[PDB]
């Protein structure tokens, strides 16, 4: 269902520690509770140099805020990865200048609005308007029905709070 | 911290069935869960004749669906009413059609931002995109770091499910 995502990413040049400012989901259930299903914190993004990707971060589980480490096996599209879970999650790169910002949204296999959720991941605990305004921009399409946002105060702290 | 208001409000007019369509709120806590403070539903509004205002809504207590009826007492500016509970909680009329939809927000007495809410509308159980877009362009302003939206299955539901 999310149908735009970036031309030429430069998997290597995402490295590095990210901030989830903002996330959006099709359901309110996906990121209603702080146990949501796709209520998930990045830290850092790790690629491998197959290309793969492995990813770093929170979730809150069991009322405590877990740590975890995700990976994103990238495929023929340089944008598009599959997370080793079950039912085959795709993760889809939208856009990205490498140094401010990345959008990102997961969906689920043959099954987008059920499930579909996107991030705007930023390099810095400030909040970005260029970053959110990209962000509401790309979903302004899509089909979604819930949205957080998250101060530096919150971006500072495990789980944002 | 709500700065537009519906001028020359008739607020005999606004009388009847209502739907919830939207919420946005300044704390993800005030919308987050089921039990959630602000997290509303409106039934339908009603007016008295002294200009008064009594309001139909169902609140999730104590994992149930509860109705309510709360009463907004109308002051010296006829968009701005005074609901009777415990710190004077203003509720602000921001626009109307009086037919198609309604743009209220409600804020503290002296503390805006830490507990500030806003809601989309309708009369209908049905989507109205012209009216998502007024609320999205009047809060686009305001600090809302939660955003929740329903489908018109859900709107039909008790508690929006
Ligand atoms: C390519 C940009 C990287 C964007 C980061 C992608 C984040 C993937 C998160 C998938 C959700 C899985 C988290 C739930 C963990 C669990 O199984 O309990
Ligand atoms: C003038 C437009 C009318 C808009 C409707 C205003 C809705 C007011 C809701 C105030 C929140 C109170 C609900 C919580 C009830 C409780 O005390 O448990």
């Given at each position: 269902?999310?149908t735009?995502?970036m031309?030429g ?9 990210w901030?989830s400012?903002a ?13 949501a299903?796709?209520?998930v914190?990045?830290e ?5 140099p ?42 889809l ?17 043959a099954?987008?609005?059920q499930?579909?959720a996107?991030?705007?991941?930023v390099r810095?605990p ?13 979903l ?10 998250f101060?530096?105060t919150?971006?500072?702290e495990?789980c944002?709070?």
């Amino acid at each position: 269902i999310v149908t735009q995502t970036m031309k030429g990413l430069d998997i290597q040049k995402v490295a590095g520690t990210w901030y989830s400012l903002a996330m959006a989901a099709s359901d309110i259930s996906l990121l209603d509770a702080q146990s949501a299903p796709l209520r998930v914190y990045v830290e850092e993004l790790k690629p491998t140099p197959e290309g793969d990707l492995e990813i770093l971060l929170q979730k809150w589980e069991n009322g405590e805020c877990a740590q975890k480490k995700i990976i994103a096996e990238k495929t023929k599209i340089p944008a598009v990865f599959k997370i080793d879970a079950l039912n085959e999650n795709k993760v889809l790169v939208l856009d990205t200048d490498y140094k401010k910002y990345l959008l990102f949204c997961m969906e689920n296999s043959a099954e987008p609005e059920q499930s579909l959720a996107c991030q705007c991941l930023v390099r810095t605990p400030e909040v970005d308007d260029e970053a959110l305004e990209k962000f509401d921009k790309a979903l302004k399409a899509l089909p979604m029905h819930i949205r957080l946002s998250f101060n530096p105060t919150q971006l500072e702290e495990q789980c944002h709070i």
